[PDB]
């Protein structure tokens, strides 16, 4: 609930958002998540266009991992670049868990 | 062993096919030992078959001072220097417990020699198959 | 489209002997492969030794 | 229709070797699984032909050794080979299961599992295989390894007495580790197959710790080679440990005869088992030693339970990487402490490293996980 | 079922390729290899190495104060008399 | 793992109690036999061929 | 109570990778054991061979 | 057709003034790709002998 | 214009890999003995005198 | 095969060995044995194909 | 324990002081020829049916 | 077995032969070296590592 060390939290936020090596290899956010069964039928539920942007996205970046380079400074991942297109249909699909689950256990 | 403990003030005298490999140090270890016998320092004392040679780990080694100069007379006719002597008991002791140090050490400059040149082949001939991956390029092309 | 594509250079990881686009490579090729083949060839020789 | 399709042995091979996809952007470190494979092999060549020498006799166990590196032609090769093979051994062992722990590998539990039980059959494979040679550290190792099994509350000594064959360890204790030094190491073996069975359903991780089915590539054109040329630096690596410097691995006193009477002063356990040891030294009762010494390994069985983190690789996760190397360089601390005598220094460094070792994968690991999880608005 | 045929679906991903024999087994390797090992180790440096330095520093400090303890033990016995 | 407690799940443990006893006592008879353990072998009224 | 004294490290010719024995020496030594140190000491593995 | 392979394929020598291109030229049912090509290259292999 | 050396030692052997195997073989053959008087010339030359082969004069053959 | 120029110690350490490692061969080649077998199917006393009735 | 001299003395150390070694060395040594029978009507068997098809 | 005869298979068997000298040059050949065979190996120009 803090203000101003709020932005400081955006400060931080931003500093290990750099130090974590996938804007090196131009990923977003959501490429690095562990794919689990319900980020499986998070993928699976994704719009063509914007899977197609993922399955290409990691495609370079697995390619860079080949060759041990790295993605040129000026086409590196911004933090305010950044769409978290994943969160809304994951957490449509954890909540529906959760539902299926709370009934299950009644 | 038990007449041998009872010929030596109860000590066994050790094997010494293994001798240098055996303590630490090695033969570095034996030659320090024929070497040192300091008298002992003022305000400690010993049994009286007990001889004081620092560098042993009881500090009172059984064993009498087994030599000094003139000995023995080398076939050679070099000097019998107890120094001379001991350098020569820890280096056939080192060989009498290491008798493949030589054929090791011919093998090894031949190993060397040899993984000096397969090194260079097989990683280059890793960079070769691998060459068309390291080089390859990729594009997106979306229809519209 | 089906024209709009085209190859991107690669001139930076050629082989000096063919990085020209005028010489036939049909006389180099012997030469490319030879040496390739010799590397493997005395690698070979090793591994049996 | 090619023929690796058609015949079935084929078809395996087809599987396991020639066909099967990879993350095209595996690295040096998973080939230290690879290299595993190979290592066991010749520790049961190179084993095969010292067992052709050796007699299992306390009365002549060392003789007959001393008959291989002596009167046996490159007798002496073969032992050194087996003797430092089994550190190298060891070494890619370790290296593999920090490859799995960093890598976050272990969300295969199963081959993770798999993993576990084979560890504990090699380790038990080359604590009687050092038992073997019946120096002074071997015969002393085995007295105070086996009286540990003794700790056990109820049936204890009645037990001790069933692995030692008598009262105390003599000839019929060597020669029962004799037959079961034989014959672990095969069933080693078809745990590896199991190990490769359970792996190859879901495909080798890789390092990015994104799923690469999008970059799946033959085994064979490439990883072939590259598994060649580790072989072939391990080759390097193990030579140069043997023609060199066959010793400094090892440690002496093992040359001399083992003495029921006699205890050697150091009695320090051979290199790979010295943290673990270490714990022993640590804790001053003797089950709480046993039982810290099994959580010891156990301990590996309960990471993917405490795994809070949304990504596998510690790569993109800064922090964890940091307790990684803290786990590291406490267990150098560990296996340094292994070496040495129990004096203040070291008797309050090693209680600090075992607490250390224990709380940092338990506690600290999770808590700065979910702290990098907040870090990054998920 | 995880034969290349059967595995995951992708849509435009043009890919480019050279034989083996068309280009050099190790291109630019002063000018780019040598750099990209560089900043690959820069990057390595401060996430692996202090700690290792921790370690040397426990070490040297634990040696010292066992070889201190165990010499000034009879040094010991000299304050003591 | 707080999702396995619930109002179900209590009925589904106790429905599975007996068997839970039972298997107990089988592996508890069983270990007894297999061990020929000493203990409560001697108070058994038959099974007394042990001296 | 206090520990035993270290021994120096020394230049032995036969310490260096590629650097063996000299046999002489190992004649010269041996003809030290032959009644020096044979008179007590054993060597139980060490034959005339 | 045995296994049922190539769906429809030809052969082809484009040749031009400088060079050429000998080849074939087939379409494929997504599981059989490799097949089809084993047996391609294999027939050239056989009229290499 | 002129072939290479490499050419003219390819098209002759490395082109059928049967005879590529026996090239191979054959370097074999003489790349044993090579290696071995050589590295065995190496290490005769770090010890001179060392090695008993050459100190056997002072005593041999009566 | 002797180790010597009469059976003596060695070679009875030498069948030792081999025995003791040879049935573990044994059992992989089994392994292979029935991985050869069970693609085709057990033979019936009558010779006839049995499709119809395993 | 395979030498030349100690092993028949094994053998009656295993026949004798070892507890139940007599009933272990006979099922053995017993195993085997019943081994060589099994496998004697075992390749008879595929001699008869036709099973050598395979 | 009677079906292998045919012209086209002595064309075949014609056109397969040299690779079988070749072939049978190599093991030849390489288990002459494998086994250091003395009575083949001295009529070499420079082989004589036996003595
Ligand atoms: C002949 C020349 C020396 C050959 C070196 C052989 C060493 C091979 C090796 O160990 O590397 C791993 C090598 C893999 O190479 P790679 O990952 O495909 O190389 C990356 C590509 O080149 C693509 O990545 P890259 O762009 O980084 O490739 C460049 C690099 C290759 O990148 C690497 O991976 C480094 C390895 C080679 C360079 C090391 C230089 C040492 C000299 O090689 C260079 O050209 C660097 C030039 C530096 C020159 C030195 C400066 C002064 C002169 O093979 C292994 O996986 C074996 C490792 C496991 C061994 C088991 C350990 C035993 C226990
Ligand atoms: C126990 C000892 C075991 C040592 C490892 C044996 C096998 C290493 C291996 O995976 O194959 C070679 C492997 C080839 O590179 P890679 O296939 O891309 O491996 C994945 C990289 O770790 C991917 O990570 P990276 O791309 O960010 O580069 C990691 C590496 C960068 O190293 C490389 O780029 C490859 C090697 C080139 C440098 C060679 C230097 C001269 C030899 O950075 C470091 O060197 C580690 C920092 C601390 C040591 C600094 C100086 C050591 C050199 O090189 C290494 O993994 C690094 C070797 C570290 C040496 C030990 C340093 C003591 C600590
Ligand atoms: C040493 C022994 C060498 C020969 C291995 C024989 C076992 C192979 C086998 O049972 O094939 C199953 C195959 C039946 O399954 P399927 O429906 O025809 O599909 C074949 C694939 O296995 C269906 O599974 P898949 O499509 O996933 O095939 C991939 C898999 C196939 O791997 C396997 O099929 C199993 C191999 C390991 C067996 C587990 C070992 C337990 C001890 O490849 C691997 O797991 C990697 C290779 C691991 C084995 C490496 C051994 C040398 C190192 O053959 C049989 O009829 C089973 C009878 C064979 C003997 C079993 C009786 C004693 C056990
Ligand atoms: C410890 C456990 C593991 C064992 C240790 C393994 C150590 C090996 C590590 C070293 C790496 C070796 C790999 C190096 C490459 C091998 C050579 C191979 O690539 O040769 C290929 C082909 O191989 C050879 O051509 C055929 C064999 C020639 C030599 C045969 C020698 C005898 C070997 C027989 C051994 C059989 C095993 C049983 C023992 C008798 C060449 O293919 P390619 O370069 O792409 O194209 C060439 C085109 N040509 C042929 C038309 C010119
Ligand atoms: C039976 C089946 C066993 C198959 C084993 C196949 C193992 C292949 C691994 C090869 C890696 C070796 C790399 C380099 C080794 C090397 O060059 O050794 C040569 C060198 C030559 O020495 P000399 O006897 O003086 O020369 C006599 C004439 N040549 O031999 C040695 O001294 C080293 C011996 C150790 C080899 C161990 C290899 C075992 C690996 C398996
Ligand atoms: C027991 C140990 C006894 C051994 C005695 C001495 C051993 C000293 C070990 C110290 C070696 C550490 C040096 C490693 C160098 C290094 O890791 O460089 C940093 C590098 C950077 O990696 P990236 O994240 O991919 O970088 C991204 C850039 N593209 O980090 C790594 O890759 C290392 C990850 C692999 C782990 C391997 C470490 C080997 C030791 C692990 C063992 C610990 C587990 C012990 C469990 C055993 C239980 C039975
Ligand atoms: C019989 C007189 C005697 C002679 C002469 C003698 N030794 Fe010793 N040696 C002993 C005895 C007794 C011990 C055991 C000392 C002990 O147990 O404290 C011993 C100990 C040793 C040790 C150290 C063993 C240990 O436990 O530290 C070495 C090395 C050794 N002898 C080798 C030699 C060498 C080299 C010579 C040089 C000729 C030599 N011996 C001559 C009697 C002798
Ligand atoms: C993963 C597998 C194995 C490992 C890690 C291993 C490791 C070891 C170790 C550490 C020793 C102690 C030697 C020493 O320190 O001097 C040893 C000795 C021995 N090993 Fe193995 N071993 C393995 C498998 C085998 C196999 C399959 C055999 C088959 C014969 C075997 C036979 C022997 C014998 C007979 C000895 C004692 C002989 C001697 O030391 O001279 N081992 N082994
Ligand atoms: C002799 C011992 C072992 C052998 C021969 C062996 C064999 C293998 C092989 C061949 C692979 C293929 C991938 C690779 O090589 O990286 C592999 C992978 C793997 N191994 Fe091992 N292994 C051994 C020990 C262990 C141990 C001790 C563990 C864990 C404590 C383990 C856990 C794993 C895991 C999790 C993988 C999956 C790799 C991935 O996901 O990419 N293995 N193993
Ligand atoms: C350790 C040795 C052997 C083992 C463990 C073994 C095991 C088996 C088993 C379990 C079967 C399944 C059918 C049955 O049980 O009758 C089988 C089938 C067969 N075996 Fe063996 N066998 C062995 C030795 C042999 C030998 C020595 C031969 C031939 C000389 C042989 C040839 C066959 C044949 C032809 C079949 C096909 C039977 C059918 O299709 O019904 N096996 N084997």
Redo the contacts with the bound molecule.
């Keep these: 609930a803090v203000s101003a060390s709020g932005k400081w939290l955006d400060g931080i936020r931003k500093w290990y958002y750099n130090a974590a090596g996938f804007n090196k290899l131009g990923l977003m956010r959501d490429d690095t998540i562990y794919e689990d069964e319900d980020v499986k039928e998070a993928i699976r539920r994704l719009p063509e266009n914007l899977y197609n942007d993922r399955m290409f996205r990691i495609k370079r970046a697995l390619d860079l991992n080949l060759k041990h380079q790295i993605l040129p400074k000026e086409q590196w991942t911004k933090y305010e670049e950044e769409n978290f297109y994943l969160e809304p249909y994951l957490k449509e699909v954890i909540r529906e868990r959760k539902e299926r689950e709370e009934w299950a256990k009644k | 062993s038990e007449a041998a403990r009872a010929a030596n003030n109860g000590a066994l005298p050790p094997d010494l096919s293994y001798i240098v490999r055996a303590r630490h140090g090695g033969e570095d270890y034996v030659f320090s030992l024929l070497t040192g016998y300091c008298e002992p320092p003022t305000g400690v004392s010993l049994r009286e078959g007990l001889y004081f040679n620092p560098y042993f780990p009881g500090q009172a080694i059984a064993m009498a001072p087994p030599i000094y100069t003139d000995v023995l007379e080398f076939d050679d006719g070099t000097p019998a220097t107890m120094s001379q002597i001991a350098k020569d008991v820890c280096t056939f002791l080192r060989w009498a417990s290491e008798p493949e140090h030589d054929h090791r050490k011919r093998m090894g400059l031949k190993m060397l020699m040899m993984m000096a040149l397969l090194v260079p082949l097989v990683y280059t001939i890793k960079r070769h198959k691998w060459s068309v991956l390291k080089s390859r390029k990729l594009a997106y092309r979306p229809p519209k | 489209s089906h024209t709009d594509i085209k190859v991107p250079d690669f001139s930076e990881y050629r082989r000096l002997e063919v990085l020209d686009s005028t010489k036939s490579s049909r006389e180099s090729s012997e030469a490319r492969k030879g040496f390739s083949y010799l590397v493997t060839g005395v690698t070979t020789v090793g591994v049996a030794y | 229709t090619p023929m690796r399709k058609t015949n079935?042995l084929m078809?395996?091979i087809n599987?396991?070797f020639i066909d099967l996809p990879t993350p095209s952007n595996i690295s040096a470190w998973w080939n230290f699984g690879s290299l595993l494979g190979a290592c066991l092999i010749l520790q049961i060549t190179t084993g095969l032909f010292l067992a052709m020498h050796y007699s299992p006799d306390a009365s002549t166990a060392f003789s007959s050794i001393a008959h291989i590196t002596r009167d046996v032609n490159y007798g002496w090769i073969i032992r050194y080979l087996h003797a430092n093979g089994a550190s190298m051994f060891f070494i890619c062992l370790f290296l593999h299961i920090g490859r799995g722990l960093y890598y976050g590998s272990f969300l295969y539990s199963e081959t993770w599992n798999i993993g576990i039980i084979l560890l504990l059959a090699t380790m038990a494979t080359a604590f009687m295989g050092y038992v073997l040679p019946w120096g002074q550290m071997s015969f002393w190792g085995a007295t105070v390894i086996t009286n540990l099994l003794s700790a056990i509350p109820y049936i204890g000594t009645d037990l001790v007495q069933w692995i030692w064959g008598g009262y105390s360890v003599d000839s019929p204790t060597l020669t029962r580790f004799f037959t079961f030094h034989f014959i672990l190491p095969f069933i080693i073996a078809?745990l590896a197959?199991?190990h490769?069975?359970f792996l190859?359903?879901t495909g080798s991780n890789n390092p990015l710790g994104i799923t690469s089915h999008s970059d799946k590539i033959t085994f064979h054109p490439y990883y072939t080679i590259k598994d060649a040329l580790g072989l072939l630096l391990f080759l390097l690596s193990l030579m140069t440990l043997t023609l060199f410097s066959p010793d400094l691995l090892g440690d002496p006193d093992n040359y001399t005869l083992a003495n029921p009477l006699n205890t050697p002063p150091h009695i320090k356990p051979e290199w790979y088992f010295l943290f673990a040891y270490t714990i022993l030294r640590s804790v001053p009762n003797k089950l709480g030693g046993v039982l810290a010494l099994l959580l010891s390994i156990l301990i590996l069985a309960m990471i993917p339970i405490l795994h809070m983190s949304k990504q596998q690789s510690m790569m993109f996760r800064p922090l964890s990487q940091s307790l990684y190397w803290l786990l590291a360089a406490d267990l150098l601390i560990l296996t340094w402490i292994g070496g040495q005598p129990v004096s203040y220094p070291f008797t309050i460094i090693g209680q600090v490293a075992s607490v250390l070792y224990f709380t940092t994968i338990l506690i600290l690991m999770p808590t700065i996980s979910l702290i990098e999880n907040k870090m990054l608005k998920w | 079922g995880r034969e290349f045929g059967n595995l995951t679906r992708m849509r435009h991903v043009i890919s480019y390729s050279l034989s083996p024999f068309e280009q050099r087994a190790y291109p630019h390797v002063f000018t780019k290899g040598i750099p990209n090992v560089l900043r690959r180790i820069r990057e390595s440096f401060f996430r692996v190495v202090p700690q290792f330095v921790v370690f040397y520093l426990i070490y040297t400090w634990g040696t010292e104060e066992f070889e201190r303890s165990k010499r000034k033990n009879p040094a010991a016995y000299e304050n003591d008399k | 793992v707080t999702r396995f407690l619930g109002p179900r799940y209590r009925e589904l443990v106790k429905n599975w109690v007996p068997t839970a006893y039972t298997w107990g006592a089988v592996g508890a008879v069983g270990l007894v036999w297999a061990t020929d353990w000493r203990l409560i072998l001697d108070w058994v009224p038959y099974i007394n061929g042990k001296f | 109570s206090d520990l035993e004294l270290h021994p120096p490290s020394y230049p032995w010719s036969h310490r260096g990778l590629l650097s063996s024995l000299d046999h002489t020496s190992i004649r010269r030594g041996f003809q030290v054991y032959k009644q020096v140190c044979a008179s007590c000491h054993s060597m139980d593995f060490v034959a005339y061979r | 057709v045995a296994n049922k392979l190539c769906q429809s394929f030809q052969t082809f020598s484009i040749c031009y003034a400088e060079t050429g291109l000998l080849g074939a030229h087939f379409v494929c049912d997504r599981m059989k790709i490799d097949d089809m090509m084993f047996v391609l290259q294999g027939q050239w292999m056989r009229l290499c002998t | 214009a002129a072939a290479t050396l490499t050419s003219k030692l390819y098209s002759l052997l490395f082109r059928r890999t049967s005879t590529f195997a026996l090239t191979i073989i054959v370097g074999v053959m003489f790349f044993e003995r090579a290696f071995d008087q050589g590295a065995d010339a190496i290490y005769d030359h770090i010890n001179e005198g060392k090695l008993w082969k050459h100190i056997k004069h002072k005593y041999e053959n009566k």
Excluded: I, N, V
């Design positions: 079935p078809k395996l599987h396991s078809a197959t199991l490769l069975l190859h359903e």
